[PDB]
C-alpha cells in the first residue's frame, strides 16, 4: 500500500519510514496503533522533519508507551484539525478536538486545520481603545487595550491564575461576544474548577474551553494553544464576533517546544532552549491579533521560571504584547494583591494622546514617587526612614500609602479571604491617586489603604482604624 | 525497463534493498518476481542478480 | 511483460519464509544497549 512503518521511538518523538513518493508533508497527521492492553490507543503523530531516505520525524500527541517498531503508520493526508462553529461554545475539548464533557460531540462540525498563516500585514491595524477593568492598578498604570494583547507575567504562585479569573469575571461576564479559554500545561484541577465556575456563572454557554494540561506529552502541550487559537480565529474571521481569548500558560507552550526540540535532536540554544524559540513564539503570537473590523482581546498568563525575568521565554514573549502586567515576588510578599510591580509593568496606550492629560499626569506622578521609593530602599534597608531628609521622608510615607492603595480586594479573591471584591471607576481612580500624590491622605494610617476599592472604602476603613477622612 | 519497474514498485526495491538477509534468498526473490521471465535478457538478468 | 501480480506471488512467499532474545552490545553508567528484540 502506501503506509509507513515506525523505525525509531525516542519518547514522544517517532521516526517513520514511508515508500518513496508517499512521504507525508510537514505537519500532516499520521495514525499509529498501540495494541498493548492497558495502553491500547491510536497515536496521532504530527510530521515535524524530513530526514531523507523517505524518513519523517514526528511528534506524538499521546504517550508512545507500548509502541512497537515496524507497526504500520497511516497518513491522514492533512494536518491536525479541530471542530469550529457555534457548536464548540459550552463544551470542553482537548488539543485534538475531541469533546471531553460529551465524547463524540462536534465530529460532524466543520473542521479547521490548526496550522495557518497569520493575517496579512495589510489587514493589521493598531488598537488603542482602552479596556476598563475596574482594578485601580491596571486601569491607572497599565491600561488594557480592547482588541489588543495583554500579558500577566509572574513566578510560581504570585497570582497569575487568580488574576486571569478576575479578568474573566470583570470582562467576559457581561461580554456580548465569544470567549475561548486555552489551558496550556496547567493544573487539571484548575481546569475542572474553571469549568464548574463558568457553569455556575452562566458564562459557559458563551465559552469554548480547550485543555492540554501538565500530564500531557510535550506535543499536545505545544499544539493545544494552536487548537484553541483556531477556534478563536474561526470566530474572528467567519462570524465577525468580538472574541476573548484567555491563555494559561503560554510559557508552558514554550517549555513543551523546548522538550520537543531536545527530542528532535536540534542543537540547544542558550539556557537549553530550542533554537527556534523566538520563531515558534512569533508564529503563535502573530495569529493572536485583531484585524481591521475584527477584534480579539487576548490575555495570556506567562510563567517566569525561578522568578528570572531575563529567561529567554518571557524575554521573547514581551515583544508581542500591547499591555504587560508584571507580578512581583516582593509585592506578593508584602501582601499586596494583585501583586503587580507598577514600575516594571507597561501599556502602549498609557500616553496623554489616548488616556487624556490628567490620567497620564497622575500615572506619571505615581510612577515617579514609587521610583524614588525604590531608589531609597537601599538606605532604608540599613538605617530605616529617619536618616532621610524631610522631603524624602514625606515622599516615602506617600509612596508606602500609594503602594498599599494600588492593592485591591479582587472579585476572585473572595474564595480565599471571604471578602467580596470591589470595582473602582477609572475617574474615581484618577481622582483618588491625584489626591494621594498631593498628600491629601497623609494623615490616614497606612493600613487604611490596604485591600479596598475607592475613596468611600478608604473613609470607612480609616474610620474603623481611628482616623477620619 | 528494470529500473522503471523497480521505480514503479518502491516496496519491492525496499524489500530487495536489504543485506540483513542471505544474498541467495534475495537473488531467488528477484528471479521469481522480475528477472525470471520469458523475455528477460540473460546478460541483464545475471548483471542485475549479482 | 510484467504481470504485477507474480510480484506479490513471490514476495509474500519470501516474507512467509521468515522467544525473542537480545544481546547487550555495550554498557556503561547505568545504561545498556541491546541488539535484537524486534518486537519490544
Ligand atoms: N487576590 C488574591 N487575594 C488573596 N490571595 C490570593 C490572591 N491572588 C492569589 N492569592 C493566593 O496565591 C495563590 C496562588 O494564586 P494563583 O494560583 O493565581 O497563582 P499563579 O501565579 O497562577 O501560580 P502558579 O505558578 O502555581 O500557576 C492563590 O491560591 C491564593 O492562595
Ligand atoms: Mg496558575
Buried b (16+ CB within 10 A) or exposed e, C1-38: eeeeeebeebbeebeeeeeeeeeeeeeeeeeeeeeeee
Q: What is the DSSP letter of A180?
A: E
Q: What is the DSSP letter of A248?
A: E
Buried b (16+ CB within 10 A) or exposed e, A222-257: bbbbbbbbbbbbbbbeeeeebbbbbbbbbbbbbbbb
Write a three-state SS string for A76-134: EEEECEEEECHHHCCCEECCCCCECCCCCCCCCCEEEECCCCCCCHHHCCCCCCEECCC
Regarding whether A211 and A145 lie in a shared domain, the answer is yes
| Grid cell listed for A382 | 540599613
Q: Residue A454 and residue A443: Cα distance in Å, rounded?
A: 17
Q: Residue A99 and residue A118: Cα distance in Å, rounded?
A: 26
Number of domains in chain A: 3
Q: What is the pairing mode between strands A13-17 and A243-248? A: unpaired
Quote the strand ranges of A319-422, DSSP E.
323-326, 346-347
Regarding whether A376 and A295 lie in a shared domain, the answer is no
Regarding whether A341 and A237 lie in a shared domain, the answer is yes
Q: Which residue has the cell 528477472?
A: B35
Regarding whether A354 and A328 lie in a shared domain, the answer is no
Regarding whether A91 and A67 lie in a shared domain, the answer is no
Residue A80 CA to ligand 2 center (angstroms) comes to 28
Regarding whether A208 and A140 lie in a shared domain, the answer is yes
Regarding whether A438 and A294 lie in a shared domain, the answer is no
CB C7 within 8 A of CB B34: yes
Answer yes or no: is the C-beta of A411 below 6 A from any ligand 1 atom.
no
Q: How many CB atoms lie within 10 A of CB A379?
A: 14
Regarding whether A286 and A232 lie in a shared domain, the answer is yes
**Close Cβ partners of A97 (under 8 Å, ≥ 6 residues apart):** A80, A81, A82, A83, A106, A111, A227
Answer yes or no: is the C-beta of A337 below 6 A from any ligand 1 atom.
yes
Q: What is the DSSP letter of A268?
A: P
**Which atom of ligand 1 is nearest the CA belonging to A410?**
1
**Domain boundary residue, one of A79, A100, A119:** A79
Regarding whether A233 and A164 lie in a shared domain, the answer is yes
Of A245, A198, A205, nearest in space to A225 by CA: A245
Q: How many CB atoms lie within 10 A of CB B28?
A: 18
Write a three-state SS string for chain B: CHHHHHHHCHHHHHHHCCCCCCHHHHHHHHHHHHHCCCCCCHHHHHHHHC
Candidates A157, A163, A166: which one to mutate for ligand 1, based on the most atoms within 8 Å of Cβ? A157
Phi/psi zone of residue A94: left (φ > 0), alpha (ψ -120 to 50 degrees), beta? Answer: beta
**Domain boundary residue, one of A60, A79, A98:** A79
Residues of A with active-site annotation: 160, 186-187
CB A262 within 8 A of CB A289: no
Based on its alpha-carbon atoms, the radius of gyration of chain A, rounded to whole angstroms, reads: 25
**Domain boundary residue, one of A79, A95, A118:** A79
Regarding whether A312 and A187 lie in a shared domain, the answer is yes
CB A303 within 8 A of CB A251: yes
Backbone CA torsion sign across A142, A144, A145, A149: positive
Regarding whether A201 and A95 lie in a shared domain, the answer is yes
**Resolution value, angstrom units:** 2.5
- φ, ψ for residue A402 (rounded to 5)? -65, -45
Domain hosting residue A405, numbered range = 350-469
Regarding whether A358 and A263 lie in a shared domain, the answer is no
Q: B interface mutation test: which of C4, C6, C10, C18 has the most B CBs within 10 A?
A: C10
Answer yes or no: is the C-beta of A324 below 6 A from any ligand 1 atom.
no
Amino acid at each position: 500500500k502506501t503506509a509507513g512503518r515506525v523505525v525509531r521511538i525516542t519518547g514522544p518523538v517517532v521516526d517513520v519510514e514511508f515508500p518513496r513518493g508517499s512521504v507525508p508533508e510537514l505537519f500532516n497527521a499520521l495514525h499509529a496503533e498501540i495494541t498493548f492492553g492497558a495502553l491500547a490507543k491510536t497515536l496521532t503523530l504530527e510530521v515535524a522533519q524530513h530526514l531523507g531516505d523517505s524518513l519523517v520525524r514526528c511528534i506524538s500527541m499521546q504517550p508512545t508507551d507500548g509502541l512497537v517498531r515496524g507497526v504500520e503508520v497511516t497518513d491522514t493526508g492533512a494536518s491536525i484539525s479541530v471542530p469550529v462553529g457555534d457548536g464548540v461554545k459550552g463544551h470542553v475539548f482537548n488539543a485534538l478536538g475531541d469533546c471531553l464533557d460529551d465524547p463524540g460531540y462536534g465530529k460532524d462540525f466543520e473542521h479547521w486545520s490548526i496550522h495557518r498563516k497569520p493575517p496579512a500585514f495589510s489587514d493589521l491595524e493598531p488598537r488603542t481603545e482602552m479596556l476598563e477593568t475596574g482594578l485601580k492598578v491596571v486601569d491607572l498604570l497599565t491600561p488594557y487595550v480592547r482588541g489588543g494583547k495583554i500579558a500577566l507575567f509572574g513566578g510560581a504562585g504570585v497570582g497569575k491564575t487568580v488574576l486571569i479569573q478576575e479578568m474573566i469575571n470583570r470582562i467576559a461576564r457581561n461580554f456580548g461576544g465569544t470567549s475561548v479559554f486555552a489551558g496550556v500545561g496547567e493544573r487539571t484541577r484548575e481546569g475542572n474548577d474553571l469549568w464548574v465556575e463558568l457553569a455556575d456563572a452562566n458564562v459557559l454557554k458563551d465559552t469554548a474551553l480547550v485543555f492540554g494540561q501538565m500530564d500531557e506529552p510535550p506535543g499536545t502541550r505545544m499544539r493545544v494553544a494552536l487548537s484553541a487559537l483556531t477556534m478563536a480565529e474561526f470566530f474572528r474571521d467567519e462570524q465577525g464576533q468580538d472574541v476573548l481569548l484567555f491563555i494559561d500558560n503560554i510559557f508552558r507552550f514554550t517549555q513543551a517546544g523546548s522538550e520537543v526540540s531536545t527530542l528532535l535532536g536540534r542543537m540547544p540554544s542558550a539556557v537549553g532552549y530550542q533554537p527556534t524559540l523566538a520563531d515558534e513564539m512569533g508564529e503563535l503570537q502573530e495569529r493572536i491579533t485583531s484585524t481591521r473590523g475584527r477584534s480579539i482581546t487576548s490575555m495570556q498568563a506567562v510563567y517566569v521560571p525561578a522568578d528570572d525575568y531575563t529567561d529567554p521565554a518571557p524575554a521573547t514573549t514581551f515583544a508581542h504584547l500591547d499591555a504587560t502586567t508584571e507580578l512581583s515576588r516582593a509585592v506578593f510578599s508584602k501582601g499586596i494583591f494583585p501583586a503587580v510591580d507598577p514600575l516594571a509593568s507597561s501599556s502602549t496606550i498609557l500616553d496623554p494622546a489616548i488616556v487624556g492629560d490628567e490620567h497620564y499626569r497622575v500615572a506619571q506622578e505615581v510612577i515617579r514617587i514609587l521610583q524614588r521609593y525604590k531608589d531609597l530602599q537601599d538606605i532604608i534597608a540599613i538605617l530605616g526612614i529617619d536618616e532621610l531628609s524631610e522631603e524624602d521622608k514625606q515622599l516615602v510615607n506617600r509612596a508606602r500609602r500609594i503602594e498599599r492603595f494600588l492593592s485591591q480586594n479582587m472579585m476572585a479573591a473572595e474564595q480565599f479571604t471571604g471578602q467580596p471584591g470591589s470595582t473602582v471607576p477609572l475617574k474615581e481612580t484618577i481622582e483618588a491617586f491625584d489626591k494621594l500624590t498631593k498628600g491629601e491622605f497623609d494623615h490616614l494610617p497606612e493600613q487604611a489603604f490596604f485591600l479596598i476599592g475607592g475613596l468611600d472604602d478608604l473613609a470607612k476603613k480609616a474610620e474603623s482604624l481611628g482616623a477620619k477622612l | 525497463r528494470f529500473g522503471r519497474v523497480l521505480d514503479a514498485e518502491p516496496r519491492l526495491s525496499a524489500l530487495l534493498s536489504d543485506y540483513t538477509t542471505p544474498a541467495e534468498g534475495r537473488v531467488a526473490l528477484l528471479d521469481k518476481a522480475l528477472t525470471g521471465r520469458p523475455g528477460v535478457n540473460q546478460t541483464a538478468a545475471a548483471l542485475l542478480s549479482q | 511483460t510484467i504481470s504485477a501480480a507474480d510480484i506479490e506471488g513471490a514476495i509474500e512467499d519470501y516474507v512467509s519464509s521468515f522467544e525473542e532474545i537480545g544481546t547487550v552490545i555495550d554498557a556503561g553508567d547505568g545504561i545498556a544497549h541491546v541488539e535484537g528484540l524486534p518486537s519490544v
